[model samples]
Target: SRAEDYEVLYTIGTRCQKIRRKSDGKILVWKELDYGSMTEAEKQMLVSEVNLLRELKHPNIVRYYDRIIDRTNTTLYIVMEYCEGGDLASVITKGTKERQYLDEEFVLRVMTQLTLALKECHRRSRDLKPANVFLDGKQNVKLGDFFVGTPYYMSPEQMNNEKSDIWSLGCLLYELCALMPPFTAFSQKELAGKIREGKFRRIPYRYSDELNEIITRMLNLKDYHRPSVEEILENPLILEHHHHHH
Candidate 1:
């Protein structure tokens, strides 16, 4: 599709834009990658990954739409679904500033959705966090940005685990409950050290002990000790939220 097919809502940095289709009024996220600067290998990888992402058909995963290349500007435009509620990080930050923590039900809601999404993907998402998980206006989780590009920084010990995504998911769940990351440091080295130690302040007491326990298991430093996505989905508390499935 041509760029003229959608009206630009706003720009993110120099490459990304939010747009709405002129005919149907459907909102979408538009990303422009610098085609000229990318090496041949990078371009090939991007094309393949985008194709793989398009093949993923899960309710909890973000939907990819049309991709367009503009030779004039050497830009590749990728259009995907728009999440009106924005990223999980923004939601948590707002709640934290308002002195209101997310409820247990909401926490379970996001956790279940993300767990389901994880089950569908064979490729692991490095550095998965609140900043990457998106939500609809109704707060339905839509996991995205997994294959966009390399993360700015690699998490330390979390990467060393066999089930790295499990650890990241636990961190995301912890953030939902506490409205902050489980670990924070002034430097990457310090952050790495803390993650290696695998210690963090407990989530607030408003949430149930069950939730704390589940998160604890997920965050186990031993990859084999971390619970799998299937286990999380089958948990009694999570099953309660799956009424429509049965």
Candidate 2:
């Protein structure tokens, strides 16, 4: 019975794989790590993250089903629910390939769910780029893959300052609509200068200025000027979306 308990669904990054467990017929995303894979500190970091994930029961976030540290193999397995649509990055690529514009309704729906998840628990998303937002079989989104990202998204003051998270969210929003970030400068100094000068690009598509305004607030040039999740939830960009849904 131990011959093969899982089926390969896909691969994540270079070292991780998403698989389906045969015993229960449940789809899962998993990664295996051994002494050679990562330092003990990195392993412990994943364990701690899983510990926090276990306590979160939000629908917008991927469910952490189970995990195991195999002493014999000296490997730690971190497993989660599988998403068929992969990451939004892939979706954007697909859109580009197909020469299609992403539907405003879909984007609105996705952002609503995403911001709700972030607001619910003060969660700092993983990257907050298209690469981390996932979609299930029905094309609905579920935010996943935390605990790792580039420092370019960092905002000081309060260790990860939720403002930083909003900034990342704003980045994703711009990327989703315009198919690129508001600031595309190659160097940090250049990008910082552009942002500090409040020189955001004119977003390509929009029905109203509300969405653009939310983008402005979240991606504020000044750090403290950025709005909080509570404030973001109240924005017409978010509230009107919520209203239309209900």
Candidate 3:
């Protein structure tokens, strides 16, 4: 638990506060949102976030220490562990003009660590998006957005809820790799033959046969063909891609 006195560092969220403990000057962030204004989906996702973070402990996921609510039940305060590296979206967007992305082995380590977190969480990702992919102080991976919400991110793949989580995962992989999505053009029935017959560059850049193969399989046209979280964990890279960094 934390004291009531906290400083407002910035207005990133609907509300956020920063508190520096007198004992060690250790600061933490408090993210907040108004309960009354939140849609039912948003409200449920908030509840799910608190429940999941409270019940599960994972190194690759965010650490939520405490929560506070006002007497009116109008505002909720979540005492969150501060990840200096912020989300992957922030990391990639820093100093850039438009949408950003990652590069090199950093991408591998991040993606694999994300996979490990998904395995630990048992596929209740709630909402899986690039903005939810966080980096800790070590510049290592941590996944945010632990609650279930809308699935707009899966629209490109035309997915179903069951195995479609892998679809979103593949989309993240694609964004991380080429800084763009896999499906770049439109379809007019036969006009769709371009990407279908492999006429265009699916991922603009390539690392190796193995990772691309795995990614290609995940983001395949058929969501039913998508791999389970277990099968994804069994991928060759996830088994052996731990970093020696820390």
Candidate 4:
């Protein structure tokens, strides 16, 4: 029933496809294909990652529907929900035609959702970022793209210690507010140097102290000292009691 009820709508990344259910017309199918040429280790790693993604279920996190291995085609297909509005990076880079900067209300709305999502991921030893964050037609945020997410958004501990996912929610939140990353040097070497030196740009004037404090905590160089997502959400400036979710 599920197979007959859906039609592939589009494709993403190098091998993923998006599908819409014909009966309900809901664009719910996201498929990632593996070409079967990967080494045994790579295949095992991918399977483990997919299992991790499957274990993660939350309102703000993207849904993992099904996965298929097409031995006939020498491919692995992963099905997920389709987010029509695309990733946040695309929205910021291409969707905004009003020359409009995201307002505090909008920023907070997305950040709050993302914060909750990150907390869930942390619980499961996963990490995420803007590339992994998708937007819907209603402007609701959903987390996706778990592959490559580890390198881009991992907390220091995750990167160096036992493959545990580190907390990098602050870095993502900072980008949401400033329209730029915490470290923007010309090269990775420069960026790493800057990060080690605790170098980060000041919060833009448009951002409030509430947002500023959160960014500061995220960019802190001391690994263990960095604030957890819960700690950040609890900061006096960002606490739920102090500010309403927009």
Candidate RMSDs in Å, in order, are 3.7, 4.2, 5.1, 4.2
| Tens-place lDDT digits, model 4, residues 1-246 | 334456876666665667777767877755656556788898888889778778777877888877666676776666787777778787556524546566766667666777777677656653456777887666667877654222334444433331122236667766666676676666555555556666678757788876776667666666566666667566555435322222
- Pairs clashing in candidate 3? 126-148
lDDT (tens digit, per residue) of candidate 1 on 106-189: 888888888878877744342477777888765578888744533322334534543677878888888889877787777666
lDDT of 2 at 78: 69
Off by over 4 Å in 3: 2-5, 36-49, 94-101, 123-125, 146-152, 155-162, 184-200, 239-246
TM-scores of the candidates in the order shown: 0.86, 0.80, 0.73, 0.78
How accurate locally, in lDDT, is each candidate? 0.78, 0.69, 0.65, 0.64
Regarding TM-score, does 3 or 4 come out ahead? 4
Worst 10 residues of 3 by lDDT: 151-160
How good is model 1 by TM-score?
A: 0.86
Tens-digit lDDT string for candidate 3 (1-246): 434455556555446666554556677777775798888899889888687667666778777777777747588887777777767776545624564444556767876787777777764544667788877677578777632433334433342154566766776776677665555544344334433442324654446676777777776666677787677667676645454134
Candidate maximizing TM-score:
1
Distance from true location, Cα of 52 in model 3, Å: 3.8
Worst 10 residues of 2 by lDDT: 151-160
